[PDB]
């Protein structure tokens, strides 16, 4: 031999990102954490009143 090979290689990016907006789905599921608590919080105390 008396052989040195030092090499590099390249990447294939994974799928599932047609557009970044997809993470806005998380902004949705934030909102259905946002839009859920006050329903019961006023529901049970609406039963109280």
């Amino acid at each position: 031999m008396a052989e040195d090979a030092d090499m590099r290689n390249e990447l294939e990016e994974m799928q599932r990102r047609a557009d970044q907006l997809a993470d806005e789905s998380l902004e949705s599921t934030r909102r259905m954490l946002q839009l859920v608590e006050e329903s019961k919080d006023a529901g049970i105390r609406t039963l109280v009143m």
């Binding site: 949705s28 599921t29 909102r31 259905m32 839009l35 006050e38 329903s39 006023a42 009143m49």
Partner: protein, 51 residues
């Protein structure tokens, strides 16, 4: 989330509506015993008007 928002609209309507009704219940709270405070107090003197 939109469907829960639709029921959320109906529910903030519901709860604030029955809230607002609670003031008519406040006027009951007036007209439930102040009504007695006239009536029972009047019949305390008509029943004793026989005396």
């Amino acid at each position: 989330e939109n469907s829960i928002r639709e029921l959320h609209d109906m529910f903030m309507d519901m709860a604030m509506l029955v809230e607002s009704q609670g003031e008519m219940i406040d006027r009951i709270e007036y007209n439930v015993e102040h009504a007695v405070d006239y009536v029972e107090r009047a019949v305390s003197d008509t029943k004793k008007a026989v005396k």
